[PDB]
Each structure stands twice: as structure tokens, then as C-alpha cells.
Amino acid sequence: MTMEQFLTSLDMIRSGCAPKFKLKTEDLDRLRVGDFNFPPSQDLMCYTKCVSLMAGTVNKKGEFNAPKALAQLPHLVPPEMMEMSRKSVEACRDTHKQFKESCERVYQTAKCFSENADGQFMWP
Numbered sequence: 549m550t551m552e553q554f555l556t557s558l559d560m561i562r563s564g565c566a567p568k569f570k571l572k573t574e575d576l577d578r579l580r581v582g583d584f585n586f587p588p589s590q591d592l593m594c595y596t597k598c599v600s601l602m603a604g605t606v607n608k609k610g611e612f613n614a615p616k617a618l619a620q621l622p623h624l625v626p627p628e629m630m631e632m633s634r635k636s637v638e639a640c641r642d643t644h645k646q647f648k649e650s651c652e653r654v655y656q657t658a659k660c661f662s663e664n665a666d667g668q669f670m671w672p
Contacts, residue, residue, distance in 0.1 A: 549622075549623070549624075549625065549626050550626055551626045551628060553626070554625060554626045554629070555670075557672075558580065558670060558671075558672045559672075561599055561602055561603075561672035562576070562599075562672045564598075564602060565595055565598035565599050565602065565672070566595065568594075568595070568598060569591040569592070569594060569595050569598075570589075570591050571589075571591055571592060571595060572592075575588070575589075575592055579592075579596075579658075579671040580670060580671055580672075581668075581670065582662040582665060582668065582669030582670060582671060583662075584658065584659040584662045584663070588655060590651065592655070593651040593652055593654070593655035594651040596651070596654050596655045596658045596671070597610055597650060597651045597653075597654040597655070599671070599672050600612075600654050600657075600658070603617075603620060603624055604616060604617075604620050605617040605620060605624075606644075606653075606654050606657070608650065609650050609653075610644060610647075610649070610650030610651060610652070610653030610654045611644055611653065612640070612641060612643070612644045612653070612654070612657045614637055614638070614641040617637050618634065618637055621633055621634065621637075629667075632665060632666055632667045632669075635664070635666065636660070636661040636664045636665055636669075639660065639664040640657050640660035640661050640664055643656050643657045643660045644656070644657050658671060
């Protein structure tokens, strides 16, 4: 995947998940630039789960699968973003173990990715 294809993919992924929830555009805009520094609604957390289920990086219980995510990366991000992503997978692989509810598990993992990101982080 090229950078151009990646950027466009963000919108396509969103379109498959956003209609399932009641979401604020301002909240989506913030996640899009990797700003997870605000309290999320349950809907927003579950939206992150929907996006991650589409990526194949989590199961329906919201458990993050590090090996599968590593294997999926070439199908999710451009070469330019692989190392940052590999590094975040590793730093955030166990975040889900601190939470029991599936949407929260995924949201907190995504938040970790955004904080651990050593470059710009973008969420669909």
C-alpha cells in the first residue's frame, strides 16, 4: 500500500463503522490526527473496536492479537509507517489485559498506540 492509498483507506474504513454508532464529528477528527486526549463515549470506544475488527487485529472480545497484527501490517499501513507500527504493537500488546469490556480493551490499546507513536499517528 502507498501513502496515498493509506490516507484514502482511512475514510473507507470509517464508512464501514461510523454508521453503526452515534458519533461526534469533532471526536472523529481528533482521533484521525491521533489525539486521544479527551474522554470517550461508549459509542466512540465501540467504534474503535469496529475499526480494529475490520483490521483483524482484535477478536470479538477485544483481545489484541500481536502476532496477527504483525502479520497484517503490510495490508494495513504503508512501508513508511511499518517500523513505528511494529514498535507500537510491541509496546501496546498487553494493554488489553488491564480491562475486561471489549470496546474498552480496544479503545485503550488504540490510545496506547497513539501515545507510544514516535511519529504522527492516524486513526480511521
